[PDB]
């Protein structure tokens, strides 16, 4: 997925979408390519426990410091656990091995915090119709980069609150601007019709972030 994403991003960036003729960005919009999932909220407690996040469907996940994962489905009880070796187990909050008591308790804390505080990213978006989990993430001075198991890469910029949701399957990018307005574009159509320098710059940055993901797999 990452290699495909890199090729898609390289292709759009090489077309110099903001540096040519009349920009027809609107013609690159494709609402059918809207993502099914993205990260609506996140909490970095990696100093001790890990990275907690909420997906737009109100499900929650934690990527713990020991590289294990716990995912709570939006029914508020069903759980999936993923061990280091990749083994996937299914359980509930009420019915679980005693060995998972601490991790389940931690997820509860993350969940409650993200239910009580913080804004839902993409709240105004209608998602497209087995949950993806957080494969890996990292932060830079300017952004947090979240790589989902379905191939999607989300980049949230800290300073201006703008966001990209990249999907290599749709070969598309969803851009959320400073006003929380959103558009989904087909990357090949951005090559065809161009885009503003703001989106173009963020796509150049996205390529460098994908390079980091690929070189640190």
């Amino acid at each position: 997925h990452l290699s495909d994403m890199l090729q898609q991003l390289h292709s759009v960036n090489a077309s110099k979408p903001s540096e040519r003729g009349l920009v027809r960005q609107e013609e690159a919009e494709d609402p059918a390519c809207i993502p099914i999932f993205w990260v609506s909220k996140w909490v970095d407690y990696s100093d001790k426990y890990g990275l907690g996040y909420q997906l737009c469907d109100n499900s929650v996940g934690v990527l713990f410091n020991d590289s294990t994962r716990l995912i709570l489905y939006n029914d508020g009880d069903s759980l999936q656990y993923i061990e280091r070796d990749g083994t996937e187990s299914y359980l509930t909050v009420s019915s679980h091995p005693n060995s998972l008591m601490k991790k389940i308790t931690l997820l509860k804390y993350f969940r409650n915090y993200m239910s009580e505080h913080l804004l839902k990213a993409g709240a105004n978006i209608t998602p497209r119709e087995r949950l993806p989990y957080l494969r890996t993430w990292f932060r830079t001075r300017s952004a947090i980069i979240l790589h989902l198991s379905n191939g999607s890469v989300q980049i949230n910029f800290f300073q201006d609150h703008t966001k990209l949701i990249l999907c290599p399957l749709m070969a598309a990018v969803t851009y959320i601007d400073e006003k929380r307005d959103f558009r989904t574009y087909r990357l090949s159509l951005l090559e065809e019709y161009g885009c503003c320098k703001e989106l173009a710059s963020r796509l150049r940055y996205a390529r460098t972030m994908v390079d980091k993901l690929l070189s640190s797999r």
Binding site: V39, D44, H117, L118, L119, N156, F158
Partner: peptide, 5 residues
Amino acid sequence: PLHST
């Protein structure tokens, strides 16, 4: 930031 908006 240690958490989202």
